[PDB]
Amino acid sequence: TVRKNQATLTADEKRRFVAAVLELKRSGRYDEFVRTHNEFIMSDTDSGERTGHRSPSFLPWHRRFLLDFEQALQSVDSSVTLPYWDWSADRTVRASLWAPDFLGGTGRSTDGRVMDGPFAASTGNWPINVRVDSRTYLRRSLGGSVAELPTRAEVESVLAISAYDLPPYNSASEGFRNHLEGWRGVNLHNRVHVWVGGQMATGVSPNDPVFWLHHAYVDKLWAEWQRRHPDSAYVPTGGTPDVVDLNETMKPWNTVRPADLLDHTAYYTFDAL
């Protein structure tokens, strides 16, 4: 129940994480996670109903989504937990994260195809099934579309924002949530998707296993923000059309509310907070 920095994983932990992810893929369970995410990212809009993105529920939603995935992983290997990627620290293509024994590296220049690691198309173990175009192989272009990943200094500036979110509760909002998501400001979360490229830059981003590590760190940053701002909490707190209020239930689960997900310690802890 402890989520660790990907850079600190042992060879066995990396091996077990990879094996668990590959089994979820083989069994067909993995692709359904990709589909769910794509469906919400395609429907969430600034002017209408928004639940998974560009809205206050962006954080609790991805928190629950990751929990669903971690639980599925644990059904294969109970020792496995989601590791997180601190992209402000491990910001180069030579990060152990992109090694052949973990996630594999960047894609070749011709078609962006990842050529090494356990998820390379050549292994026959990672077919891209849920997609927007005909390409069926994992693609990446680390640092191709955007020059740099966020810096610690930039992350600190966002963590310093006191208000969790603010009307109109969408991509135009000031406040922590939108700055962490990245639609406004120095851009943290969105920029990382862009930096990785390939499927990670599209609606079917969970096709790349790094998706979970990226969001696990985004999730950790929410936890860090809570520690810095004990007097700040989730908003809105009632009667907001198209937005998930604190005590309202979230789709697709329908049985959980942001209020049930604010405290992560009920589900897991971090190696260091």
Partner: protein, 71 residues
């Protein structure tokens, strides 16, 4: 007020746009696009990278596709 329609061949591929709130096509296949509160646009092939216009989104898609047909 929705943006104007457009029709051109970009990097060997035909891209079209037309108000509906707005539809975009790459070689006759529709490309799902979305408008942000500030007026910028994103597409299903570039969902976390806002661009100024629907044509910009269409061209970005063609760039990303590298010749691949949209589904």
């Amino acid at each position: 007020a929705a943006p104007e329609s457009f029709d051109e061949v970009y990097k060997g591929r035909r891209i079209q746009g037309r108000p509906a709130g707005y539809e975009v096509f790459v070689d006759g296949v529709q490309l799902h696009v979305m408008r942000n509160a500030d007026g910028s646009w994103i597409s299903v092939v570039s969902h976390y990278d806002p661009v100024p216009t629907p044509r910009a989104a269409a061209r970005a898609a063609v760039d990303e596709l590298q010749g691949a047909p949209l589904l």
